[PDB]
Amino acid sequence: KDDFAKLEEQFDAKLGIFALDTGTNRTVAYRPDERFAFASTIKALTVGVLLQQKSIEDLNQRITYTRDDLVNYNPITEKHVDTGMTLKELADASLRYSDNAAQNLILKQIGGPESLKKELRKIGDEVTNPERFCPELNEVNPGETQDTSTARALVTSLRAFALEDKLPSEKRELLIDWMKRNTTGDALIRAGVPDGWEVADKTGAASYGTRNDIAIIWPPKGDPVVLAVLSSRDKKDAKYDDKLIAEATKVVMKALNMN
């Protein structure tokens, strides 16, 4: 709070925090409106819009691609160049493996960053600014607002798709299932929540030591909490530490008296 400034002290980083307890409407905010590169947290929002646009049957449509649409590491999509993959399999890979090439294919399907912004603006997210495909591949420098969001806007938008009415119940269920089954976030929000409690999350990292996680957290009984923990550092090549995110989550949970 305070403990938040202490974490920033301990990790030499800047935190961005917003949490909403949907049970009591309690809010926890630390630089909630400070901008960070959203990095792969955008993959969650991109699937929300894909689901909005496509019937569940339409997710069976096959997308073909070549090795030249893959750059650096893409753990799922490098396995299926020969066959291509369905939209459903791409959403799975994007969300649970943070597959860059799968995210790009999905983004292309929905009409690119311009169309994603349009749809975000349509759900009343006036802050999230998608501008580039695969922004991962660009040397993005500080003070730029392209491909940034805030902890507050990311919670509001994740909540809108995952928990409110921007998606019908069966599609909301797909989004939640994929995020619950994420493989990349064990040391982040998940490491900061009490044992047992279900977590659905999407992680991201960039440069300037950017390390992000956005989540929905269910207490065993009671309504969920939606949370964004964003972080960055002063130097372009700064290392991040996952533990910062785990510890910031602990402070949120304390403040929420849990849940």
Describe this structure in words.
It is classed as hydrolase. The entry lists the keywords fluorophore, Antibiotic resistance, Cell membrane, Membrane, Palmitate. It forms a monomeric assembly. Crystal Structure of fluorophore-labeled Class A Beta-lactamase PenP. The protein has 259 residues and is an alpha+beta fold. The chain has a single domain, classed as DD-peptidase/beta-lactamase superfamily (Beta-lactamase, 3-Layer(aba) Sandwich), CATH 3.40.710. It has eight helices and nine strands. It has helices at residues 3-11, 42-53, 87-97, 100-109, 112-122, 151-162, 169-180, 242-255; strands at 14-21, 27-30, 36-37, 62-63, 85-86, 148-149, 198-205, 211-218, 225-232. The strands form three sheets. The protein has a five-stranded antiparallel β-sheet with strand order 2-1-9-8-7, sandwiched between helices. A two-stranded antiparallel sheet has the order 3-6. A two-stranded antiparallel sheet has the order 4-5. Helix 2 (42-53) packs parallel to helix 6 and helix 2 packs antiparallel against helix 7. The protein is globular.
Q: What's the SSE blueprint?
A:
Layout: H1 3-11, E1 14-21, E2 27-30, E3 36-37, H2 42-53, E4 62-63, E5 85-86, H3 87-97, H4 100-109, H5 112-122, E6 148-149, H6 151-162, H7 169-180, E7 198-205, E8 211-218, E9 225-232, H8 242-255
Antiparallel strand pairs: 1-2, 1-9, 3-6, 4-5, 7-8, 8-9
Helix pairs in contact: 1-8, 2-4, 2-6, 2-7, 3-4
